[PDB]
Design a protein around this ligand. Structure first.
Ligand SMILES: Nc1ncnc2c1ncn2[C@@H]1O[C@H](COP(=O)(O)OP(=O)(O)OP(=O)(O)O)[C@@H](O)[C@H]1O
Ligand SMILES: Nc1ncnc2c1ncn2[C@@H]1O[C@H](COP(=O)(O)OP(=O)(O)OP(=O)(O)O)[C@@H](O)[C@H]1O
Ligand SMILES: Nc1ncnc2c1ncn2[C@@H]1O[C@H](COP(=O)(O)OP(=O)(O)OP(=O)(O)O)[C@@H](O)[C@H]1O
Ligand SMILES: Nc1ncnc2c1ncn2[C@@H]1O[C@H](COP(=O)(O)OP(=O)(O)OP(=O)(O)O)[C@@H](O)[C@H]1O
Ligand SMILES: Nc1ncnc2c1ncn2[C@@H]1O[C@H](COP(=O)(O)OP(=O)(O)OP(=O)(O)O)[C@@H](O)[C@H]1O
Ligand SMILES: Nc1ncnc2c1ncn2[C@@H]1O[C@H](COP(=O)(O)OP(=O)(O)OP(=O)(O)O)[C@@H](O)[C@H]1O
Ligand SMILES: [Mg+2]
Ligand SMILES: [Mg+2]
Ligand SMILES: [Mg+2]
Ligand SMILES: [Mg+2]
Ligand SMILES: [Mg+2]
Ligand SMILES: [Mg+2]
Lengths: 458, 458, 458
């Protein structure tokens, strides 16, 4: 088999099980601002601060000083590594270039090489022969190169002259697709000669750590399962769940608007902080100010928990970022605070004007990470119809579902709670009446008289 | 990192995270009449009207006289600034010759800011070589340049020869997309080599003040929340809400046509003018004439309040402007009148033949601003069916929902009201019938004889 | 008729009705990384590894060393065959000169098969004249050639200059269409001058064995059917089915979330391992961890069966691969483990954001194979509404349908099971209520007090 080299890019090594083929050159074409330079810089940088491999960078447009300054925003200096003799920024902004580049390879331990960019170098018949010569001349030296080419259309031709794709051994497309006034970064591997890889696009983001590729296909169902129970915050609800929620489980609170989803989330988050356990609250519908007042009215101090460094509140609008970003933000915030419990209020708000598949691929990401890090996730979902079906087919991700619906009785609005699922546990299969007070919720008995709920009244 | 310069354009300082990279040039492409020249002038202008930095202006097609004549429209004299020495409009009626004149004028007034409108006149393989030489000679002078490009398609190639983006360090695209015979201005940053920015299209308008960018992403979920309550105009309604509406809250009055939504809006505004508090009425369904007749019929003198400078009525058809304009008009008017209560009649009318995405982002922009300005807002919504739900997922924005519906009883069409939800407050969970007279709402008792009304037919 | 040659590529021998026309050449066009070179090698390879026929290989861009290095990946040494004389890789570093060298090498080893990868390198009016001369000089030598072309668009012009199809006797197009960020390999025969073939696109995958074409059309309705019955894990269920499921049959367990579909799958697999019979569990909703916990909770040791080599659990996310892969993975695993019972949990999860056409053709490919392998299959389907139908038209594939649904009775959520249909058997036509415990299903009696359940709300 062809030996792959680890680029040390979070996700990319999963997409191409191993990394990039050693001895050959990888073509990374993409529209302007797709992260071609970043990828090629991050490739060389990773290969010097992990395997101390002497890499050479070829410039064709941007000056060396520009590349150094631009890469300084990611929190790494290139001039320091150039000073050490571990990097070489060959400034060039025909055949001799190959021999000059080859010279440095043998004169600075030919590890990794990047050429950003070649499109301006050869700025469609001549393109082939010129591109065919370079790759061949780089094969003889047997060093791992990355070539960055530009494309005009996001789903149009692979490159500018539409020829490089065949000439190259490896093809990587960086996309910056715009849908509904929103840009979605995706990276896909078009081909890998004599090796296997993951097919199709994969959502990625660019932060202070660099390119953060989020593979969904590498996510496997290995989430360890325990019989460890944890109090939901309601004694009556814990009895109804046959002891309370499972430490390694995903609880779903679906219902109509004003039913008490946030209440159950608040009470679930308070419980963590009572037992001196860390918890994160991801708000998307309400603000910290409104959350603190709302909790206060039920008799729960959210400031107290914040002062004890046991509860964190992250409020933000869904339309203020993308699903890729939102997921990263959760992971980053979870990576720092490392909570025992988590609550997303809510997924319904996060599904507002988003690809039904882009949202579906987000839920798995959050659900999986929570399960894979042994964190109890409670996600709320507001139903569009007042007074009910999932209508999303995402009930196969949740291990527990709390139903909250209104019951119009004697020209009076009354609320009702019920547990549908409790995988690996017994649950009370009754529709108990509950109401809200200054001391929180109170679950009473069920309605034996009216047997026609999840519809109307009698 | 990379030092950024403030452009002092409302919204661009948030979308850019701080502004435009210092020392480097920014390319602004767009179709004709997008606001390229405007952005160009406004950049240099605020430079010499805030940080007092001498900026030179290169004009190729448009003559200085015209530039000043057009600039005046917004309300700022350029010739006065040309007269002093803070700005120099270098009329451009070979690159080296032009570059020399620009370079020899950048040291004369020691210009910090530079705008070239436009570089798509002087002029694919040659455009790159010329453009590369231009930015290189401007990079050496360490002057923050702004270059304006020209495109033919709105979602087609970024520039004319589709090569000006890879040569530029920064790329700002201004669009003017036509959807259902309606023109929507949008601004997006494609890339910023070095720093970070906000990805995606952001709606903006051009008024007397200049460009007015409304970033919905920059708007955080930091909205002050108090337990201060206020009246609604109805004593029983205040009592039904458990002391009346919250000062800092968004109330929603949804129901079938002729249920009495406008009645609740009227009384809501009246009560404001009763406590000598200023309010605004945004009508999109009925005129001042009909409102005054209907109000006067209900025993509420809207002329009086109008003369007392406590009530301002602004009527205009929903299809008389875009959501962008309607929002900017609401904000402008609010800032002028500085009201404590605001009522919109209605959102349903504002959703008339408008994309759910563009409508979604408008309701967030209105509710968000009112919440951050400590202004109590009552928004009405007319349901499609007489006998329903919550339109879409705008129930996450309203802190209170007052449902009103009809109840056919013994061949009579009686109306019923109920506080469906109230966050942070107790509310009457009863469906009380109410009559309308020339005195206003008459909330009586609920219907215990028949329990199947609410969001149902009985 | 026209004599055809077997390529020995799984599926191509059925789609072609027998293979490629003998004496004539075949043109294989496709975008980059479709599998043109692979198909090229695999053709010649099987030639000299089955019918022991010396085949020569023309390489234009890719060097012999690379071709052998890439070929190795699949698991076959080319240099060994080059060493012997069964294959000769004629490196192509004027037509008459090249044609001469090919013609002078086709008589040396007396080559029966020939591949030219690729003819889109050497090179609209001239391409025809050259191509026509090439096939004419290969027709005279009566050698089955295979020419690889290159296309830019997936559903655009067949070849580059769109003239290589009318000059060729045979045209095979390899596609790699991207639909919702997912890459789907497809192979179609456009025409075969002389013989007949299968019209339309056919899904195929590339694995370690090489190209793997899955013709759904070639699959006939010849599926052995016996009166041999088997148990389900439940005595009452076997009795309710009129002696238990048929050995050769497809059973479907559809219903709302948490109804007990996984319970029935578990017991179904357990019973197999009870009679010392091998089974496979294909999970796409829950992990091994959760399954083992849930199983153990139900009184079924999935570790034991795992250690007894009677039960194999394979969990993986539905969006972790394409239907093509999932199918090929199921077939591969089945052939290895050779199980008598198979259960998929679930099809609904496998339909998550997938075209109804691509999903339809996957269920036919799975059910068809299991039916022709004498393997009893239980497939689960989670309904969108809690309280429904048969998803789509997949009821024509299932020989037995076990419906499970909830029945709100006196403010209690009880579950009900019923054998909806059973072909070739009597079944209990009664809606019997059933409870769940740590011992498994408890099928009790039906509800004679209320006759309005089934696919209704009462
Ligand atoms: N500190 C940062 N935080 C977040 N994102 C950043 C940061 N620095 C840069 N970026 C992002 O990465 C981009 C860097 O552009 P880059 O040069 O990697 O793209 P490219 O595809 O090579 O562009 P081109 O080849 O057209 O010049 C910026 O435009 C921005 O979107
Ligand atoms: N202090 C209180 N006393 C009594 N009842 C209260 C109190 N605060 C809230 N409630 C009741 O509980 C509801 C609050 O529910 P919650 O804030 O959890 O909203 P939700 O069900 O998540 O709906 P949404 O997210 O759509 O607003 C109010 O609508 C009201 O009916
Ligand atoms: N005083 C004003 N009030 C409101 N809108 C104005 C005012 N003055 C100009 N506008 C708007 O802004 C536009 C001016 O755009 P500008 O002159 O910058 O064009 P441009 O983007 O440079 O395009 P081009 O170069 O093709 O002329 C007008 O077409 C109009 O829609
Ligand atoms: N003076 C009055 N006396 C009695 N009933 C009245 C009087 N004026 C109006 N009404 C009643 O109340 C209604 C007034 O309409 P209102 O503005 O309260 O409803 P709306 O929900 O705003 O209707 P629309 O959806 O058409 O805007 C009339 O249709 C009528 O039934
Ligand atoms: N060992 C392997 N296991 C699985 N898949 C493989 C393996 N080796 C190669 N592949 C797949 O097959 C592809 C090889 O295709 P091939 O080299 O024939 O390209 P091609 O169709 O000739 O295109 P081009 O001429 O543009 O390179 C790889 O891109 C990869 O997706
Ligand atoms: N040990 C137990 N004792 C009692 N009841 C149990 C026990 N374990 C599970 N249950 C009940 O049976 C259900 C188990 O889910 P099961 O896998 O049988 O349903 P499912 O149809 O596969 O659900 P989903 O659609 O979510 O996959 C729980 O929701 C609970 O109601
Ligand atoms: Mg770049
Ligand atoms: Mg809530
Ligand atoms: Mg202009
Ligand atoms: Mg009205
Ligand atoms: Mg090839
Ligand atoms: Mg299940």
């Amino acid at each position: 088999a062809i030996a792959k080299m680890r680029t040390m890019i979070e996700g990319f090594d999963d997409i191409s099980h191993g990394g990039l083929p050693i001895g050959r050159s990888t073509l990374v074409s993409g529209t302007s601002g797709t992260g071609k330079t970043l990828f090629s810089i991050q490739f060389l940088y990773n290969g010097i601060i992990e395997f101390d491999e002497p890499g050479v960078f070829v410039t064709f447009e941007e000056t060396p000083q520009d590349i150094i300054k631009n890469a300084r925003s990611f929190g790494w200096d290139l001039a320091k590594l150039v000073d050490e003799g571990k990097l070489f920024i060959l400034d060039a902004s025909l055949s001799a270039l190959i021999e000059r580049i080859n010279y440095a390879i043998q004169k600075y331990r030919a590890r990794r090489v990047s050429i950003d960019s070649v499109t301006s170098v050869f700025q469609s018949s001549v393109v082939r022969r010129e591109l065919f010569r370079l790759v061949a001349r780089l094969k003889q030296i047997g060093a791992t190169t990355v070539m960055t080419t530009e494309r005009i259309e996001e789903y149009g031709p692979i490159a500018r002259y539409g020829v490089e794709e065949f000439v190259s051994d490896n093809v990587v497309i960086l996309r910056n697709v715009l849908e509904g006034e929103r840009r979605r970064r995706t990276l896909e591997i078009l081909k890998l000669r004599g090796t296997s890889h993951m097919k199709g696009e994969y959502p990625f983001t660019i932060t202070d750590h660099g390119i953060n590729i989020f593979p969904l296909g590498a996510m496997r169902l290995t989430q360890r399962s325990s019989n460890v129970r944890v109090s939901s915050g309601v004694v009556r609800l814990d009895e109804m769940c046959g002891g309370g929620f499972f430490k390694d489980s995903i609880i779903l609170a679906t219902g109509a608007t004003g039913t008490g989803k946030t209440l159950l989330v608040s009470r679930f988050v308070e419980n963590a902080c009572a037992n001196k356990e860390r918890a994160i609250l991801f708000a998307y519908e309400e603000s910290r100010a409104q959350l603190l007042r709302n909790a206060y009215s039920w008799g729960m101090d959210f400031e107290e928990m914040e002062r004890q460094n046991l509860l964190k509140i992250v409020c933000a609008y869904p339309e203020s970022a993308g699903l890729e970003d939102h997921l990263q933000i959760i992971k980053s915030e979870i990576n720092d605070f490392k909570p025992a419990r988590i609550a997303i209020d809510s997924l319904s708000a996060l599904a507002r004007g988003v690809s039904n598949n882009a949202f579906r691929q987000f839920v798995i990401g959050v659900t999986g990470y929570a399960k894979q890090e042994e964190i109890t996730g409670l996600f709320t979902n507001t139903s569009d119809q007042f007074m009910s079906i999932t209508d999303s087919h995402i009930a196969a991700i949740t291990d527990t579902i709390i139903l909250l619906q209104y019951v119009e009785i004697r020209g009076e609005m009354s609320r009702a709670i019920n547990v549908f699922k409790m995988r690996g546990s017994w649950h009370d299969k009754a529709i108990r009446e509950f109401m809200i007070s200054d001391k929180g919720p109170d679950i009473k008995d069920s309605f034996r008289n009216f047997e026609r709920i999840i519809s109307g009244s009698p």
